[PDB]
Symmetry: C2
Subunit: 359 residues, 2 copies
Amino acid sequence: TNPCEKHSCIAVIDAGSTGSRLHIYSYDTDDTNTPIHIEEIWNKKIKPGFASIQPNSVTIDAYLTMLLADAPIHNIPVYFYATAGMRLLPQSQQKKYYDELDYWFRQQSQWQLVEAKTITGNDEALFDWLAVNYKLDTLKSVQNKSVGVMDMGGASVQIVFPMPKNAEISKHNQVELNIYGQNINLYVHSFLGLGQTEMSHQFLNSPSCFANDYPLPDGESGQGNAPSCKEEVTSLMNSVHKVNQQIQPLLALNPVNEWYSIGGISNLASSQLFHFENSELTNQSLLQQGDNQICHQQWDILNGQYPDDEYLYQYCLLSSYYYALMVDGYGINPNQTIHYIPPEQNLDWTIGVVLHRAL
Amino acid sequence: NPCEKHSCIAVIDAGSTGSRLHIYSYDTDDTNTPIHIEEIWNKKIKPGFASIQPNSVTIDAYLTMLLADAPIHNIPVYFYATAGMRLLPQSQQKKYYDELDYWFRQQSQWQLVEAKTITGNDEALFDWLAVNYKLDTLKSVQNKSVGVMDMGGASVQIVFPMPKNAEISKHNQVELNIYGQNINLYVHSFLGLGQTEMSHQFLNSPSCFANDYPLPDGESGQGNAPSCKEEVTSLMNSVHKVNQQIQPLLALNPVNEWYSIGGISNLASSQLFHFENSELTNQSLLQQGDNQICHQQWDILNGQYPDDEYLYQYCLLSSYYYALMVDGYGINPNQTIHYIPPEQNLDWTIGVVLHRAL
Ligand SMILES: [Cl-]
Ligand SMILES: [Cl-]
Ligand SMILES: [Cl-]
Ligand SMILES: [Mg+2]
Ligand SMILES: [Mg+2]
């Protein structure tokens, strides 16, 4: 069966810093031609990030072929939206990637490329909030509670929550959204350089951030201590980026009732070393588990016991960093529940694109 | 044929932004130490080795592009990677080396001696040996202290003479004997403070770009070098504690002449900046970047200078170099800093030719 013969279908590609994810969505539309019944009918993910690969024909051909070739439906519109990995590069370097990608799409006849472009972290934050609230079924009716969303990426992190329009705040950080006949005002912010890969490049020689005896590039040995690593990461959040100064006053005035996180935190929280129930965690418990299970354990033993976790060596650092970002940066209480979407649900911001081309 | 009358060696600098193959001819003095070191071949390729996908196809293409057209084979080769590879865990670096080893064991003209990631402290030692070799200061005991700075894409090094002592970590002190003389150096490298890695923390800072430059988040540049420098100094000092680590040692071991290599040579040599005698001061560098890039209208300035791919970054880079050298290292903003002309192709690889004989 091809659902796309009976329902509208589009393909959306999340071209993230650490990899690209193709989704094919089928949907119907209600009275205003707004999508409903959105279903993912195909998903494929590849590594590494599109902005990391050499921008020549042969490399981009291998990459796009790997991403698209085995898709069961090809004669549909395609949106290719890159996020913070491409935002790291100047517009001149990005142009080479889009020229090669445009050329590739023109060498074949099935996929109809609608747009290929780098979106801003503010657009990425709006799509993050739309994607999670569509899954929560909170978009069709006016809500009593405030839902905030966090997306933990490899190069940037987003935070987005309801906030009335404020003339003192940049226009770029505020979005007025009309969807399903309701009007929604959002604060959006993205912090470029505070994603997990970029942040980690500032702490690779910090012994407190690695399991005991992990080999640091300077020849010293890891000596893990999550509260100590967390204080180091907080200097990058607040002394450098001023996360606390920008976010805490706004959340004080516009409290969030439920927090949902997507991105890398879902993967860490779901791993064998951590234990959380009901797809929810607290920062207090995340930091204590990371400290006890990873930071204070012997690297050779951990490495041999978890040979499939390719991110294991960063788990002490990540536990520390997520705490630094959420508690010290955003001002979230260490005991506050944070929901995370299970990784097997393949939920990224791309559902937001399905919804908001129509609004 | 230069190698029929001289010893010859190939050294590859596999840096964060690309790899540079050098082939050197040399003679040796009475202790078999190199002298008369002459570059007889140079080839540079981009991007950095640690940035490419680690499969046998991609690595063969990369090594082929680097080595194929070399005029001389049948010589020892050192493949030394620096901070780009230091960004990767050993398990991922192992994939690169395993493939690279395969490639060399296959062919019969290059003689691979070693392929490894060198520490930042070793890179700093080689930085110091290469510059002093070129200055002709190694033959005899110097009356003066020469310090060297290497400004890379992912790490920066600093290295200067310091007498042996019980106080400082042995990990950052190096002793060598060369041309019959005993030299003791302090060495340090700061990973993540190279220009590429540093810049990823400030791309949405309007103070760090020309007026109306389009920032990735949709806001506009509004350049102000002093402000941009203050932002970069928080990463130098509040995060890395550069000042606390470096300034007490330089106070105790003052440097008479500073030489710099790496990205600063390319910036200072560009058409936007004006320096005489291949030397700059930090205050002049900051003033020039502020006037000639930070406070300019981006589209107009880009149209005036079409030939410079790095132009958009010059407000940030002038601010960053001042933050690192003045706020981090404690160098006086009016102190002369020599930079080696880029055309000279001086990286730390001459240090390897010298050090492997000691
Ligand atoms: Cl290092
Ligand atoms: Cl590649
Ligand atoms: Cl952004
Ligand atoms: Mg993402
Ligand atoms: Mg270098």
